[PDB]
Amino acid sequence: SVDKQLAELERNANGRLGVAMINTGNGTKILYRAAQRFPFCSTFKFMLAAAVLDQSQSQPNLLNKHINYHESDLLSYAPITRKNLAHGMTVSELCAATIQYSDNTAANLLIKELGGLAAVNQFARSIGDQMFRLDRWEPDLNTARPNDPRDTTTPAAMAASMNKLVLGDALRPAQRSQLAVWLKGNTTGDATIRAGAPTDWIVGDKTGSGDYGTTNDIAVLWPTKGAPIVLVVYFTQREKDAKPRRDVLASVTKIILSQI
Ligand SMILES: *C(=O)[C@@H]([C@@H]1N=C(C(=O)O)[C@@H](S[C@@H]2CN[C@H](C(=O)N(C)C)C2)[C@@H]1C)[C@@H](C)O
Questions:
Q1: Is 90 flagged in the annotation as binding?
Q2: Structural domain range at position 217
Q3: Annotation-wise, does 206 bind a ligand?
């Protein structure tokens, strides 16, 4: 029983947890509050990177476009764009730094490139994600305030989106392969989904955190045995200044993967 382990974990943690798992092997799913909205935090950047890859399908030079951004574009959390300030970065490098370091300048630059917040939402709509809603730019989208639907999705919608994009036919093969490569090279995810997964598996993920101790992580897991698995874990807590609970996500992963 996942449900009772999950509820116990959630009650002990004093948060709300949302979980969707899809096993693309047999098509089983494990759902917990899967249809409830949660602040997506940096997990949006997954959907952002996918949208950029979608436009690159029309525009063969898009990923190679060199972006000479300036000092003014730099945000508080931007280690990789800060690193490359002098020389600029390609759109492709911007997507990698957004996914793998969650760089906020790289994200905001890619939204500009797509032509605004609404372009990401319209992309989400094009793939059948009806729950995804991006309302603000980085980093204002991480306030994660109680009962604020801004900058939110559902675990189920996000899992279905990751499924279609990484493991499905929503993108052309070069694009979707690039999307999985970016994810596999994520550097921020060691303590969350990765830490609860068998040490011989490969995990591609995008993390997220914000106020109210919001702690999120979305992943494709490549097992040693069968087909890939999509896991989306969202978690949020009572108080604004809650510390993130990366251990809760690793625990969920332990709980979920045991079942399969
Ligand atoms: C989005 O989630 C944020 C950027 N992506 C992050 C991530 O995936 O780790 C963050 S948070 C990082 C870990 N916790 C610290 C923190 O600032 N929070 C607890 C809020 C640093 C990275 C800044 C960003 C847009 O909020």
A1: no
A2: 2-259
A3: yes
